[PDB]
Design a protein around this ligand. Structure first.
Ligand code: HEM
Ligand SMILES: O=C1N[C@@H](Cc2c[nH]c3ccccc23)C(=O)N2CCC[C@@H]12
Ligand SMILES: O=C1N[C@@H](Cc2c[nH]c3ccccc23)C(=O)N2CCC[C@@H]12
Ligand SMILES: [Ca+2]
Ligand SMILES: [Cl-]
Ligand code: NA
Ligand code: NA
Length: 393
């Protein structure tokens, strides 16, 4: 049986996804390379909609300790719950999450986000020679997003510790199992020592809103909130922004169009979310009872995966799916998922993506300083990221 994942750590998607999509079944059996667990895999848009909109396929049951899984180790510090955003929703914090992640948070932060994107790009444009868009643009912008909107102000050393923990824990391979587990322990212990300090600093970052919310969360619960915000917000935003910059630098005609027609930038943001691959794994859900999807029986307790990259490149949903085409008129993309677990970070993500696209579109001529095939990729990360993006004007 086919093992999962497909080791497509660069922007070139594994051919397996299109092979399975065109096969004679709407759901295909695979086996986790890291655990040996049997799993089901969906690659078609129409089938993915039905799965992800059926609440009898549960995300929490697939997150839970002991579930069949695609990842080699559990994504939690041993002895903690590690059950994700469910822990905060269950504590009654939906309103707080809306305040800290929703349109009001974007209104509060979009000004400094755009000012920072411009400041960073202006500094790079002042340099003689090449620079690295990953280290010199994405890292400072994503780190500021995390500090100012999610956690509170971090030192460089704290940011480096959390980034290392995320990169070490959120992996299919490349580190030992024990190193991966200990990354989660280190992050949890960091927040046990520092979450209350971070939550008490001035600002409106989400961790402060959580800590102050009238249910009072314990130190352990606040630490779990910190770890959630790191894993959900940091490697995702950094990986995506790097990947979106590569897409843009490889499509100078599209950038020129955005330079001339800034009103088209939002359409380019949405097309980047469809076109630019991020996760090398899949969203997943556990059948909470015996279910059927397009004729295939899924037994209670079995886990079904949807590859968002596969769905976003489904030719039955998008005409010429492998073409970057801002303004294409097709269905909604799956870059933020689908259904009740749709990314609650989507407003802040779109804000930072838009700020980046506009910073690039204002400065035509930005190009890669090496060929795309010369970009080196971190191998095995859940969320693709290049080691560097050499660039120049
Ligand atoms: C920047 C690019 C981002 C992308 C492309 C992205 C994408 C996604 C996707 C596809 C999901 C759905 C997973 C599933 O269905 O199981 C998701 C969930 C989630 N995202 Fe985002 N995300 C991004 C940024 C962020 C940020 C900045 C935050 C927080 C500040 C965040 C917080 C979350 C949380 C907490 C969930 C879990 C939702 C749930 O399980 O109900 N995301 N994200
Ligand atoms: O809140 C959650 N939701 C799902 C999807 C996910 C969203 N962002 C993630 C980042 C890494 C892994 C999985 C996800 C999950 O697997 N979870 C374990 C870590 C965070 C938790
Ligand atoms: O690679 C992963 N993706 C997320 C889902 C996701 C898909 N695309 C995303 C984009 C952003 C956040 C989460 C996702 C998830 O549930 N995982 C369990 C173990 C592997 C890890
Ligand atoms: Ca195509
Ligand atoms: Cl089990
Ligand atoms: Na459908
Ligand atoms: Na719901």
């Amino acid at each position: 049986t086919l093992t999962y994942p497909f080791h497509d750590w660069s922007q070139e998607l594994s051919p397996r996804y299109a092979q399975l999509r065109a096969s004679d079944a709407p759901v295909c059996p695979v086996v986790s390379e890291g655990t040996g667990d049997p799993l089901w895999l969906v690659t078609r848009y129409a089938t993915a909609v039905k799965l992800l909109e059926d609440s009898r396929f549960s995300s929490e049951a697939a997150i839970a300790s002991g579930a069949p899984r695609q990842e080699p180790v559990e994504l939690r510090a041993p002895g903690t719950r590690g059950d994700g955003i469910a822990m905060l929703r269950e504590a009654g914090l939906r309103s707080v999450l809306a305040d800290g992640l929703g349109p009001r948070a974007v209104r509060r932060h979009q000004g400094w986000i755009n000012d920072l994107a411009e400041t960073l790009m202006s500094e790079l444009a002042s340099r003689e020679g090449t620079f690295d868009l990953a280290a010199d643009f994405v890292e400072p912008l994503s780190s500021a997003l995390v500090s100012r909107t999610l956690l509170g102000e971090l030192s460089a050393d704290e940011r480096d510790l959390l980034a290392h923990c995320a990169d070490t824990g959120l992996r299919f391979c490349g580190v030992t199992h024990e190193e991966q587990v200990h990354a989660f322990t280190q992050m949890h212990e960091f927040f046990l020592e520092h979450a209350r300090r971070l939550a008490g600093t001035p600002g409106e970052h989400l961790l402060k809103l959580i800590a102050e919310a009238p249910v009072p969360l314990s130190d352990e619960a606040l630490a779990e909130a910190g770890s959630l915000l790191v894993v959900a917000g940091f490697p995702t935003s950094s990986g995506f922004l790097c990947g979106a910059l590569l897409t843009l630098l490889r499509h100078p005609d599209a950038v020129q169009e955005l330079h001339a027609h800034p009103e088209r930038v939002p359409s380019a943001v949405e097309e980047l979310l469809r076109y630019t691959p991020l996760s090398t794994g899949s969203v997943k859900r556990m059948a909470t009872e015996d279910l059927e999807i397009d004729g295939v029986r899924i037994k209670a307790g079995e886990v079904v995966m949807v590859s968002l990259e596969a769905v976003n490149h489904d030719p039955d949903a998008f005409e010429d799916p492998d073409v970057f085409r801002p303004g294409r008129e097709g269905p909604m993309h799956f870059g933020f998922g689908r259904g009740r677990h749709f990314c609650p970070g989507n407003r802040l993500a779109r804000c930072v993506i838009e700020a980046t696209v506009r910073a690039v579109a204002r400065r035509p001529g930005l190009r890669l300083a090496v060929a795309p095939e010369e970009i080196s990729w971190h191998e095995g990360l859940f969320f693709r990221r290049p080691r560097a993006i050499p660039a120049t004007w």
